[PDB]
């Protein structure tokens, strides 16, 4: 009820009642909000509404102070002062960017640009507002009910009339009814139940709309530079394996926070785990948004760090499987691996936040609120994929606007850059180096002579909006007959519907570009499927072709990206 101004910090009792997060505003800033926007409801212990019986005047510009009460122009007493006058709204202890964050619908790219270019408190206001908007949008969707059960993995659904149907992919996680979370993939639909239960007919699912908590901590803590390693104790016996990162590990101990840009296969988790060997007494918390990113850090830690000092933090609501080898939920172990939403309230000597392109400003802030650390390290790559922005439908979100860490990496550059790709055949490294890394990424591997490209537009069909290209899958099938070593390839495309078709026709394991991020395979077969902004996205393209260790086959739709691929072209 009585708090601090989200703009200039000048204490007040005035909260905007029209803002979905109800932020406190000072006398000066509340005025500049109500007179420039449709937002006219002003709060305190008592709201600014006409006290005269049965009067519906709530607009603060049409209200006045009659002693210690509030009334409109039609009900005010002779001795009454306007609540809105002289650039101020009457309150105790007596902006363009704040207005736009407060009133935008978050469907445009410019809304996200602003949410990242504004002041720090406006970043938290923006992150709270966006997350709250995203959750209330889930409520707009229709309830799905089980009509019949075909088998242990297939079912038929009945939808609510009037309310739209959400897109079916492993992106949208429903909550069965409390029979556990469930996901869907396309009249022959497949049901992916997180908890194994006999799919009851009549039982329904609904999109988990968790409540949005307020943000207290900043996205980035204030930067501190030191002239000596602070609170960390190095070794002069770090294995040659991690010696390439000694100068960077020291930079970590000489700054409050540091950023690491690591292109694919340049040694990000090797750097992250090697930081524990360089400061062997330090308590380190390894965090990331996804369970898969946390698990990939667990796998590297399992190889170099003592297993008895490790613990994998798993929340009670087990939404999918997790890394099994560390002791579970022992919050007190020297090494703690946990997702951002499951983080306990604790301290650390170092906090490592991985896959930073997937973080939102909300995630950056939660980490600063749940973890108080001597040093924070942000590992990721702004040339890789960002978190899906479900409300964003107009415009494209550039990497400098993914989050505060990405913004720093794209404007002032990263503190540390891993320049040598050790995963990919040089054809791939040379392509992405020119495409997204300003020719600064170098190849450790030779050219494999197993990277191919084919320009084939085929025929584009759609499953609602998720696209399919059966002729591009036909070309893959023909290629497989002539190149049987490729029988072990992973099939990748920008669309679930393309992947579902390729799975039945080719029999290859399937993966979307977005779900492939962080993973590597010997052989990759990629079909572009369409020439949309989604399938032409250079960060998505970069992720797609950098999954391969040995060979890649790219069936392309876009001439531009095809021409850039430094691969042997194939005929047909
Ligand atoms: C657009 O570049 C290419 C396209 C196709 C092939 C076979 C090679 C290159 N470029 C190189 O191998 C580096 N000069
Ligand atoms: Zn203010
Ligand atoms: Zn408002
Ligand atoms: Zn009135």
Swiss-Prot record:
Domain CV ZBD: 1-105
Binding site for Zn(2+) 13: 50, 55, 72, 75
Sequence positions that bind Zn(2+) 12: 16, 19, 33, 39
Boundaries of every (+)RNA virus helicase ATP-binding domain copy: 237-418
Binding-site positions, Zn(2+) 11: 5, 8, 26, 29
Signal peptide: none
Stretch of the intact protein here: 5325 to 5916 of 7096
Annotated effect of mutating residue 248 to S: In strain: Omicron/BQ.1.1
Catalytic reaction list: ATP + H2O = ADP + phosphate + H(+)
Residues that coordinate or bind a ribonucleoside 5'-triphosphate: 262-269
Assembly: Interacts with nsp8 to form the replication-transcription complex (RTC): nsp12, nsp7, two subunits of nsp8, and up to two subunits of nsp13. Interacts with host TBK1; this interaction inhibits TBK1 phosphorylation and decreases by 75% IRF3 phosphorylation, which leads to reduced IFN-beta production.
Subcellular location field: Host endoplasmic reticulum-Golgi intermediate compartment
Organism, as annotated: Severe acute respiratory syndrome coronavirus 2 (2019-nCoV)
The protein's name in its UniProt record: Helicase nsp13
Protein's job: Plays a role in viral RNA synthesis. Multi-functional protein with a zinc-binding domain in N-terminus displaying RNA and DNA duplex-unwinding activities with 5' to 3' polarity. Activity of helicase is dependent on magnesium. Binds to host TBK1 and inhibits TBK1 phosphorylation; the interaction with TBK1 decreases IRF3 phosphorylation, which leads to reduced IFN-beta production.
Annotated LRR repeat ranges: 208-228
Ranges for domain (+)RNA virus helicase C-terminal: 419-572
